[PDB]
Amino acid sequence: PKQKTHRASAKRFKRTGNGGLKRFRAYTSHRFHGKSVKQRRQLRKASMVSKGDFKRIRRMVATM
Amino acid sequence: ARVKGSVATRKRRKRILKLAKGYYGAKHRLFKTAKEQVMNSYYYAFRDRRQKKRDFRKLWIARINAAARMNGLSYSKLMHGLKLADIEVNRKMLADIAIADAAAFTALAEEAKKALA
Amino acid sequence: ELHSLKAAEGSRKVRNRVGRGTSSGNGKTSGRGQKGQKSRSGGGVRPGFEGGQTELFRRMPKRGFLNVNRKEYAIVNLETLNRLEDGATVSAETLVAAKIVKDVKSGVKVLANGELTAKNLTVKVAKVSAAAKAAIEAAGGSVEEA
Amino acid sequence: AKVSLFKQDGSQAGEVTLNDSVFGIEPNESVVFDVVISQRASLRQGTHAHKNRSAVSGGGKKPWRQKGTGRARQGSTRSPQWRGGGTVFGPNPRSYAYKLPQKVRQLALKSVYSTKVTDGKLIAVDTLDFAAPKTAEFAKVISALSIERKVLVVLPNEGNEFAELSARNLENVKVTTANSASVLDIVSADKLLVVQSALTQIEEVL
RNA sequence: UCAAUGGUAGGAGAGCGUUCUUAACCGCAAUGAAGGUAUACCGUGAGGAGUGCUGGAGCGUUAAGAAGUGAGAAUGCCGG
RNA sequence: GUUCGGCAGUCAGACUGCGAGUGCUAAGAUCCGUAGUCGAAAGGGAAACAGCCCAGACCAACAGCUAAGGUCCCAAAAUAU
RNA sequence: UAGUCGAAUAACCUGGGAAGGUUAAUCAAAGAGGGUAAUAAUCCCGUAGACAAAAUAGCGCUUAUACCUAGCAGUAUCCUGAGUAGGGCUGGACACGCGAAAUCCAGUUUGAAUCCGGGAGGACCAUCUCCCAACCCUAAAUACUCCUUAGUGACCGAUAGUGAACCAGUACCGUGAGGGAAAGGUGAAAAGAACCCCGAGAGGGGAGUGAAAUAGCACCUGAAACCGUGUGCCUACAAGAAGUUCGAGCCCGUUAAUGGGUGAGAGCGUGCCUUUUGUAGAAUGAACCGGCGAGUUACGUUAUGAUGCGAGGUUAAGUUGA
């Protein structure tokens, strides 16, 4: 019928208009001992999604 | 819309078999060995569109060194005298003078004699 | 044109009869090359698949719960106020009788962007941004929010 | 403009209150054959069926077992390749309808409309609503200019009834109103008579 | 005029042929439709008609649409 | 050439040298880098030959010239100097 | 549920036969469709319309009857749906996988209040909103057709179309449950071949039949593999993917063409398919011939164009209607 949007994938992602998606950081949940002082200084924030990868967007994250 | 085009299909069959006719025995009494049998034949008819070139030229140069060798002349020094010779570097009509040309053959040979000379 | 029905460009082109013949072929192959999981029937492959490794999205943290009481106002530009002059009592009746958007999130809001062509004060709102309150309220407006 | 205003064909050579509003344009024939393809199959019933091996059958059991016993890996005679032929993907009970948006529909009427305007094979006709329904009447009124190949017949929207409960045996007569409009209406006949109420039989939506 | 034209899986473009298409356009048909058969034509190809003969009812045009639509080959199947 | 967008397939190749590794510095053996070749590229040469060498084919053609390689006969050119 | 009437035409040419071609005329609520020896509006069935049923199964309208209801202010107290709500545990359904878990329904256990009442408002405690369970019935709009016709087809033409156009669920298999085939067409009309002759008979052959007898009872049309019979050339010193190309020589004369059929001889030539790195293959596979026999659509998204209008595009479902 319709194409079912994966709601938990929507809980993974958040994309922008005329632009890419915001991807929160890896590693940032479970232990914090061995990750560095600088990695604590910088890995609260995170960067965007890839370019040549992530083209498996289609269309598993439809219209959310 | 369960349609067939049956007579059209057999007209392709008929078309290639009528164009396949002539070869040995069972082949037109069957279908598919005949299919290569025209086909291989003009594969190397395509090669013999280059190789009766390259064998009628062997007849050309061979018979002209046959008559040159009848004048005791070898093809390589004859042709060498042909590049030494005149505006004529004419080849295979000069092969065609094997009929009855002591004048054209032996005299053009003498032109080559005054070309090596 | 029923004598000589003709078609124009672009609307029509041959639907590619894929899987017959010798030229495009594609029934021998369908673009594919044999002897593989790709090379079979069904089209059976899940899209997100790191080869049995967990996926990109499968490595994501669970971020941010969602307000059930999330509610907005179907925000318009002030560029439509550049369209309509003055439309005294700029409200939802001016908005949907202007037919800008009909199904609206209950209120209305304008940007400071868009221009101060309108003259009327009594703009009936639920909530306009204070950046636009600088614009119209410094440009002959009155606040009637809700 | 001026084409007809005939009280009968041949009997009053006058104007046409078309009106000469927007009708005079480029007739977009792209849009035209779009309406011939979408207006086409608006009466395709499409009731051709489709079947399956699992639709009609007698056999859901393998008829031997393969190993050593001659032939190949094999489903059944009920598997389609036998005389018990299952269709592969075939037809289906499908519909075929679509209708265009309004502005390209009225644009499409006002394309062939315009072609009939400058063509003038439409002729403005009065009522000529007759006593009997007999078609010697309309045989000699329609043949009183005798447009030969095939003709559309613009009634009023009050529903004339005498060429209309008849003239279906008149082999070129197409009984029509303002509630008849298509391209299979008009491009079909290309040659037509008018009831001169065609302002409030044409303009009112167009 | 110059330059290009090996080409598989690959990708793009274009065209042929079959059948149904109410469409029309517009004919053929017993002096012979279709279909078959021989054929020493043409078309780059797929393909197209000419004639001879069988044969005695539907078929062809054009253009466009729609397709169970283009046949060797699978222990393919069925029938011989 | 970049960028953007569709659409692919390719995952396992050999072989020839050249430089490595392992192996009896055995191998038409493996495993690298490096070029070519085939694969997916006819024709010619080496007796046939996918891999070596030369030479990349739209087609006609009863044209010539030439690459390597050949010129006592098959089998063409030098019983050449 | 029986059916009834029901309009509108002649000749010539052709042929075995006109409705075909030709010449003319008519009709009109009927030029839908089907037959007719060959394609019909005017030949027929019919068709459009217009009539017809006692019995027949109904539908619908009018009639009093075929019977139980109302408002209304006040509130003496009663009532209003007890193992009932609930609570424990075990379940389940609810989007709800025990969860913060609502809410409902089960088993089991415990067990109220009852109009100052009680319940719901996703644990729950207050305020507010709404309702009154724990008693029963409720058409309508909906689902699907074995069926009854009225039918419609860009359904399908005898491997299709129902397994089954045919005495099909037949034959037949199997003890059984089950399975499960094959096959239609003469000719208009059998007018089906009187007779005569051969022949044990069949079958043939003459005659005659019919437009036609290659048309003769599985009969329209008749390939294809298979078997032939005749035919011009060549081959009994030859060891070929069975070929080209050239061609001695022979024979014949054509979609009239730089003709064809040959072909001695001579050069050079490893079948086709999937897979593979590479197959000529001693890697598969194919007896042959013909028929069938495989990338769709339903809905959705994306991309690309085409068209339309444009910050304005857009009607879905539905209604109307053929």
Cα(D125)–Cα(D194) distance, rounded to whole angstroms? 5
Contacts of D121 (CB under 8 A, 6+ apart): D147, D190, D191, D192
E-state strands within B18-60: none
Max CA distance (Å), chain A: 51
Tell me the C-alpha to C-alpha distance, in Å, between residue D23 and each of D91, D108, D198.
42, 11, 14
- Flag if D30 and C11 touch (Cβ within 8 Å): yes
- Flag if A13 and C61 touch (Cβ within 8 Å): no
Please state the φ and ψ torsions of residue B51, each to the nearest 5 degrees.
-115, -25
Determine whether the distance from the CB of B53 to the nearest atom of strand F is below 7 Å.
yes
Cα(D119)–Cα(D124) distance, rounded to whole angstroms? 13
- Flag if C48 and A28 touch (Cβ within 8 Å): no
Provide the terminal-to-terminal Cα distance of chain B, rounded to the nearest Å: 86
Q: What angle is formed at CA D27 by the lines to CA D21 and CA D28, rounded to 5 degrees?
A: 130
CA neighbor of D180 nearest in space, from D154, D151, D161, D203: D154
Q: Resolution of the deposited coordinates, in angstroms?
A: 5.6
Question: Is D2:D16 a contact under the CB 8 Å cutoff?
Answer: yes
CA neighbor of C115 nearest in space, from C99, C139, C97: C139
Question: Is D159:D198 a contact under the CB 8 Å cutoff?
Answer: no
CA neighbor of D188 nearest in space, from D204, D200, D173, D203: D173
Minimum-distance nucleotide, CA of D45 to C1': G153
Cα(B64)–Cα(B75) distance, rounded to whole angstroms? 8
Question: Is C130:C146 a contact under the CB 8 Å cutoff?
Answer: no
Give the helix ranges, DSSP H, for D120-201: 137-142, 183-189
In D, which residues are within 8 Å of C8 by CB distance? 29-30, 33
| Cα of B73 vs its chain's centroid, Å | 26
Region of residue C19 (left: phi > 0; alpha: psi -120 to 50; beta: else) = left
Q: How was this structure determined?
A: cryo-EM
Distance D152 CA to F25 C1' (A): 100
Distance D39 CA to F31 C1' (A): 70
Tell me the C-alpha to C-alpha distance, in Å, between residue C114 and each of B115, C83, D35.
98, 10, 42
Please state the φ and ψ torsions of residue C122, each to the nearest 5 degrees.
-85, 55
Question: Is C62:C95 a contact under the CB 8 Å cutoff?
Answer: no
Enter the tokens of residue D202.
């044409």
Coil vs helix vs strand at C3: coil
Three-state SS sequence of A23-55: CCCCCCCCCCCCCCHHHHHHCCCCCECCCCCCH
CA neighbor of D116 nearest in space, from D156, D160, D147: D147
Burial of D150 (0-12, 13-18, 19+ CB in 10 A): middle
**Which C residues in the span 8-67 are in contact with D, Cβ-Cβ below 8 Å?**
8, 11
Stated as kind and residue range, the H or E segment containing B34 is helix B33-51
Instruction: Quickly list DSSP for C14-82.
Output: ----TT-SSSS--SS-SSS-SSSSTTSSTT---SS-BBTBPPTGGG--------TT--------SHHHH
Cross-strand bridge partners of residue C123: C143
Stated as kind and residue range, the H or E segment containing B75 is helix B75-84
DSSP type of residue A21? B
The interaxial angle of helices D29-39 and D102-119, nearest 10 deg, is 110
Question: Is D113:D88 a contact under the CB 8 Å cutoff?
Answer: no
Nucleotides of E under 7 A from a protein CB: 8-11, 13-15, 17-20, 22-25, 35-40, 46-48, 62-72, 74-78
CA atoms within a 13 Å half-sphere pointing along the CA-CB vector of C94: 19
Cα(C86)–Cα(D146) distance, rounded to whole angstroms? 62
Tell me the C-alpha to C-alpha distance, in Å, between residue D118 and each of D18, D99, D111, D174.
11, 28, 11, 22
Coil vs helix vs strand at C27: coil
Distance B117 CA to G246 C1' (A): 39
Of residues A12, A53, A56, nearest to C47 (C-beta): A56
Sheet of strand D122-125: strand arrangement = D122-125, D192-195, D151-154, D173-176
In C, which residues are within 8 Å of A9 by CB distance? 48, 57
- Flag if A56 and C59 touch (Cβ within 8 Å): no
Enter the tokens of residue B82.
């042909």
Enter the tokens of residue C100.
């800008």
Question: Is B109:B71 a contact under the CB 8 Å cutoff?
Answer: yes
Question: Is B58:B92 a contact under the CB 8 Å cutoff?
Answer: no
Tell me the C-alpha to C-alpha distance, in Å, between residue D20 and each of B39, D1, D17, D25.
70, 6, 7, 11
C33 Cα to chain A: minimum distance (Å): 22
Question: Is C78:C114 a contact under the CB 8 Å cutoff?
Answer: yes
Distance B24 CA to G245 C1' (A): 18
Cα(D24)–Cα(D118) distance, rounded to whole angstroms? 9
The dihedral through the CA atoms of D142, D143, D146, D151 has a sign that is positive
Determine contact: D32 vs chain C, CB below 8 A.
yes
CA neighbor of C81 nearest in space, from C142, C15, C136, C11: C136
Amino acid whose CA is nearest the C1' of G180? D58
Q: Is the peptide bond before C86 cis (omega within 30 degrees of 0)?
A: yes
- Flag if C6 and D33 touch (Cβ within 8 Å): yes
B with A: 3 or more CB pairs under 8 Å?
A: no
Amino acid at D30: S
Chain C residue with CA closest to A57: the answer is C48
Cα(A22)–Cα(A61) distance, rounded to whole angstroms? 13
Minimum-distance nucleotide, CA of B25 to C1': G242
The interaxial angle of helices B33-51 and B53-70, nearest 10 deg, is 40
Tell me the C-alpha to C-alpha distance, in Å, between residue D114 and each of B73, D108, D119.
92, 10, 8
Cα(B91)–Cα(A43) distance, rounded to whole angstroms? 86
Q: Write down the residue that tokens 């005791």 correspond to.
A: B72
Q: Write down the residue that tokens 């614009």 correspond to.
A: C135
Of residues C48, C61, C62, nearest to A56 (C-beta): C48
Tell me the C-alpha to C-alpha distance, in Å, between residue B116 and each of B62, B108, B109.
21, 12, 10
Burial of B117 (0-12, 13-18, 19+ CB in 10 A): exposed
Minimum-distance nucleotide, CA of C38 to C1': F9
Cα(D153)–Cα(B27) distance, rounded to whole angstroms? 68
Cα(A55)–Cα(A53) distance, rounded to whole angstroms? 6
Cα(C80)–Cα(B51) distance, rounded to whole angstroms? 83
